[PDB]
Amino acid sequence: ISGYHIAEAGANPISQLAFTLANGFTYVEAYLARGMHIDDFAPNLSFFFSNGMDPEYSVLGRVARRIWAVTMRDKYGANDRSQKLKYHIQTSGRSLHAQEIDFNDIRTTLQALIAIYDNCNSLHTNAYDITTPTAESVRRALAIQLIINREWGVAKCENPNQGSFLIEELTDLVEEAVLQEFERIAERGGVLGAMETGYQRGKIQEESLYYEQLKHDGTLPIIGVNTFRNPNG
Amino acid sequence: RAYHRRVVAQSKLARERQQLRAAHDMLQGAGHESAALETLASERDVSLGAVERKLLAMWPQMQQAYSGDEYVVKIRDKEIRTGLISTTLSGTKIRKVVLPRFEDEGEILKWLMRENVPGSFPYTAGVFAFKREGPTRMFAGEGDAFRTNRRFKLVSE
Amino acid sequence: RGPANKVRFVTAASLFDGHDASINIMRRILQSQGCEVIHLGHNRSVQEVVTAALQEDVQGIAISSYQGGHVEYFKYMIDLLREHGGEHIQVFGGGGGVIVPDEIRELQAYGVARIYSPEDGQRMGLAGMITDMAQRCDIDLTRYAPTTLDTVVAGDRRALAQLITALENGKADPELVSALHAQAKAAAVPVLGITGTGGAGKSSLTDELIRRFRLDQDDALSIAVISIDPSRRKSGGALLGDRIRMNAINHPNIFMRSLATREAGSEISQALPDVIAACKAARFDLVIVETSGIGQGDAAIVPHVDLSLYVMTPEFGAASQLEKIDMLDFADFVAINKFDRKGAQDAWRDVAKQVQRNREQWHSRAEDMPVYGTQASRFNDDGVTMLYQGLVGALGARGMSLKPGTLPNLEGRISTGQNVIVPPARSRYLAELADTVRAYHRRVVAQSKLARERQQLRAAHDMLQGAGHESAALETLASERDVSLGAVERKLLAMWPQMQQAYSGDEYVIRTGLISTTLSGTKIRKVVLPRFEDEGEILKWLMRENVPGSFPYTAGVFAFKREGEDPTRMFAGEGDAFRTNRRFKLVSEGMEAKRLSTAFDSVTLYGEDPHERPDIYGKVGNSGVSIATLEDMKVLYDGFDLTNPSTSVSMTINGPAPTILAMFMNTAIDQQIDRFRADNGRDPTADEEAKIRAWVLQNVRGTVQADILKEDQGQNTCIFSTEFSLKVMGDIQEYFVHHQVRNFYSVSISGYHIAEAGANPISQLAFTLANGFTYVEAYLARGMHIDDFAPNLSFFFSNGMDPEYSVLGRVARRIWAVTMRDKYGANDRSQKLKYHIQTSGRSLHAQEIDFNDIRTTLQALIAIYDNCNSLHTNAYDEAITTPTAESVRRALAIQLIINREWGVAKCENPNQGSFLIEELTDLVEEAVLQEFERIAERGGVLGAMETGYQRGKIQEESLYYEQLKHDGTLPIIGVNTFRNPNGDQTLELARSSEDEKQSQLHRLTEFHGAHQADAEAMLARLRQAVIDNRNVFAVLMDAVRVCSLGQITHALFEVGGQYRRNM
């Protein structure tokens, strides 16, 4: 179950997480209605998210894990292996730009950091470059993970997020926001019923436009793009 | 939402249960023996769920586990020891998993139910106990099957 | 086994260079491999290093040059060596990434043996370089030794230096030796021996005495100095550390040779009588011999000299110990040095009476004995002069023609240096502070236990009444704890619900927004409050880590971060004042708040004017802006309203800090004078100008570093003596108080420099806070209200990769706030510690420079998370050059991305709550307190510096780190692991234009010509300000108007002395 494309298309972190978990639960309900046991396909389910600059991304993983674990235990009565949501996080490619490509390593570092902090299962790091994935560009991207995992001091702790007032409050907020979105999809006939109306497509498109607007508006600052621009070009 | 409602209620119970027994021990330290407190306390032992009661019960044993320099856990017939400490150039012991220092059993249970340690339900801080030591997949795909295969063999040499 | 021959080295840092961290860990490996190392320390000209290497007759010279101008420097050295019979001496160098590959091939082609790049260090290893370096210099120098005394007696000092190397190694012909002693006997020159306990001040006193000789006799005396230091027989070589203390030996009439004992026991070289005889035959007017640290029953210097001088400190234990000291029975003079120490007076009366007893001169007064109380550390000490006057009279009777002196022929035996920085009563101030903090935390634990129990009781009381069974017995125990709780603590819990309602809404009623909404529609509160139910935890949190803007200000000294003025403040400085003024406008472009940070070139950092000599010329305008006159300073900040409320300038200067500050102040004043003359079309009257001038001083906003305590410990930019700098630094703060300069920071108490030298985060934080508290104790003993100077105290730290850096700021704030409140009883403005954080430069490398942006991002992040007051970000070409135009934008973008784009940053206290952060905060805090106790038991910060405790600990930690960086135990991506399969072009560099150098020279000579009349007069007034002990800075406010930086500095040298290096 992926959500990389959904976010990349323009969906904010809440929409991405909500739609993806919704899609995941859809597969579950689909397989169950084939008369299958929950402990037979749930441990095979893998997830795939995006990490951007938005605050919600910092707690995206932990929210996804809790919503899954609680529902898989209480609602579907599955075992421990099933309650464990494993996911891959890939840094936001949309968040990187063609103007001042050296700045992208800064953004890709910050995104890679909160991924590792939030104990992700798998991480991909984006290159600074538009151009083909040069062997030089891939090393700078690969070094970001190597530096954080090996050099960065805070990373030597495996649960540095836990305890933080900001993290716990954000976790609760995002979680509820996701649940509310579940209810919106549910009153549209489930995920399949919503797709019939193009609800998801519509909402993603709506948010992509809103982002692309504030970006041009100068309201949403992007360093090297709409502010602090290159004095040469 | 139902799960969280339970966390709030069970915390209120665990908190009150502690507050009562705490006051009971303080009265006996002054001389006054009022078992009226104990009745309300034992009343909340039943009010607490089976799962929740065991969570608070294992909390001191949990603290002793993540306290040492290693993490002893016996699977099958053998055991799997894991280091908890990484020491800095300054000589500071950085624990892999840092436990809270709450005194209130209401907060302890609340934390254990909402955000347990990595590798424990609801796996908020991770699905595994500790991170793996040492994974980078080898992606390749272009041209015909022959070229993609050669790249696969070359990278995975 | 070490080298085949007696291999000797001369090690130093280049001119106007403070970087000793590199050269210090090299002389350690050199010494351990069995080499005698004559360490000269930092800031050494070519004429200094070469003269040293020639007199010591070494095989090798090791120089570190991190300031640039290294090409000109090494070329000069190579040239000067060949010109003066030192062609066979090999020269080695290193400067990290500063010396680019092309310049290495150039210099090595010129004559330099080897210059090591950071890549060389990785491939060869630390020991590998020194092995290569030592094996090259493993040559026998006795072949260059003269066979006849013809050259030596004539006056050839180089032939003398080589003859000594022959005599010391015993390769000199027997018939030549006896012929030397024969002429040495007929020479009849006095030989003064100076012996004493270890570290008493034998070298320092020797230097001062020589200075007296020069000033008294107009440098007409030819003096030979033979200093002996003990040799570690384990390695084979030694650390001859006497020459480093000598500042008065830089003169053609002065010769000095450093000898190792070369025996694990004896305090004299086995060939000392030969070496002395060699100097006697070389027609020297006086020979002075310094021994090593001798015991109480040691006196091997007596039979070899004509006069002996025993040096001791007031600390010798009981008065009965003096009866065990053999040297008190032979010494012709006894110098009780360090007379500033406690119990110096009583120490003198014991030694005096003991000498009287040993000589059986009962018919004489005890005060008439040749026992003197000296303070060599003190410039122009009257005690030392008294000792000198005595030595002259003794040497006079022993056949030594000398002119009637020009010095104050005073009377007495004891120094009258009544100056004290920290009174011995307050000696254990750091320990008291440690107790103060620990006491505070003990209270938090107790008050929490009370608040918790109080709640638990009343909770149970309400639950019983809900069931029926009412027991007022509970309430009695509850009301009992209402009184147990303190007044302050009770109000804290009382305001907690009102506090929660405040940070809950969308605004903070002046009204401030609390909410920033994301693209998802999530409300991110600026300050996130805990949701604890336990009042024990609430109070515990309120006392240990309150919200930002509340005691103890752990999460920040201010309620909310500034709206427009970001903490960003980029360091800048290159070329002349004109070019840097462009870079200022580049950095501060697009920002309503102009926050400048000025970097000065190595020449200005050492208070020198730019000059034609290659020593200095090559360094002008490099590594920083070249500022020499007030006119340069004015140009530097042209177009910047310094008196504007949204404009702050941060100048990084230490040694000449008071002089530079006076220039800045005069600049800010002149700006408003020019602004008035334009808005009124007329010059302001004497009264109008007085009002303007006064107003400027009050509202001018900026920061001058000037932390001298860290100069001795870390940066080494101290030019005058440590005591004099502290004196003038106090003058500055007194000036500020008088003129109500309440917006400028008189000192940036730093630790960044200490850290980059090699100190781990704990050491950095501890030393810096210790230095800060030292200034506090110094000012308090000096008669200033704590609330008068504490709000003017600024801090500066480093942020590296280590875990402790994440909580460095919050720890510094709490330790300060608690101590300033409880211990010193200062007000709120004083309890608030404001600091600047700059990302670690040593954490960035020359290999794979693109990786540095990753590290600089992570470091910048935890700085902003921990609510820093000011932040500097390092460029990616950090290891190679001063930030290029393109390089400074990438560094500046790091802050812009985090502050604007990064989501978590929209919260202002994201650290708070974290189990890791709070545990780390507690650990680091206690670790700092323990270090306070270690410094306290060494006599405070000043007492520790006396032993070189800080410098020792820093250099040790620097070695430990470096041993691991090359090792691999400590992974560094792109350096010791994950290397490039290629091994990698030409990067743009920030060097100064030739035209810019000639510009600065022409501007200087033009400035000098302008005030040629008032120059000598003003400088004379300045020295009288020091002599009459008035306010130095007050005169500098006038001095910088007619005098250049160099003129002022050198004028102060005649009256304030020069810094004595401390290894």
Ligand code: B12
């Ligand atoms: C630490 C440091 C400092 C510390 C110095 C602490 C101390 N007591 O030594 C502090 C913070 C005080 C400092 C201050 C300044 N510094 Co500084 N500093 C650095 C830094 C980060 C590393 C230098 C270092 O000590 N490295 C540790 C050594 C052991 O490693 P290495 O250099 O890679 O060396 C290896 C090999 O080359 C070999 N080698 C090196 N030297 C030698 C010598 C011998 C004899 C041998 C055999 C081998 C050898 O040994 C090592 C093996 O791995 C560099 C940037 C960088 N990362 O390169 C800037 C840097 C050198 N400093 C710089 C400047 C400009 C300054 C200042 C003048 C700034 C100012 N305007 O105020 C000040 C003032 C200095 C003064 N007091 O005069 C610039 C130089 C610019 C230029 N020359 O073009 C640099 C390059 C930073 C920059 N990018 O702007 N500095």
Ligand SMILES: CC(C)(C)C(=O)SCCNC(=O)CCNC(=O)[C@H](O)C(C)(C)COP(=O)(O)OP(=O)(O)OC[C@H]1O[C@@H](n2cnc3c(N)ncnc32)[C@H](O)[C@@H]1OP(=O)(O)O
């Ligand atoms: C190694 C090497 C290279 C050699 C070096 O040493 S490089 C060294 C580089 N050094 C530096 O860059 C040092 C920089 N440090 C500083 O500038 C100095 O230490 C600094 C960092 C200390 C100077 O920083 P500032 O931004 O000017 O700010 P301020 O504290 O002066 O602020 C001045 C008033 O404005 C208000 N205010 C400010 N921020 C507020 C906020 N968030 N909320 C509310 N009000 C706020 C208050 O009224 C303040 O005054 P008061 O409280 O007395 O009423």
Ligand SMILES: Nc1nc2c(ncn2[C@@H]2O[C@H](COP(=O)(O)OP(=O)(O)O)[C@@H](O)[C@H]2O)c(=O)[nH]1
């Ligand atoms: N407090 C104090 N320290 C001094 C005095 N004279 C020298 N020192 C310091 O003592 C240390 C060692 O000095 P040094 O001359 O090398 O002693 P030596 O090893 O016996 O020759 C240095 O830190 C000096 O600054 C003094 O009169 N008072």
Ligand SMILES: C[C@H]1O[C@@H](n2cnc3c(N)ncnc32)[C@H](O)[C@@H]1O
């Ligand atoms: C000592 C530290 O000071 C900084 N530094 C030194 N010189 C400059 C300069 N001209 N511009 C900017 N930063 C500088 C670097 O970050 C270095 O590591």
Ligand SMILES: [Mg+2]
């Ligand atoms: Mg000495």
Ligand SMILES: [Mg+2]
């Ligand atoms: Mg000595």
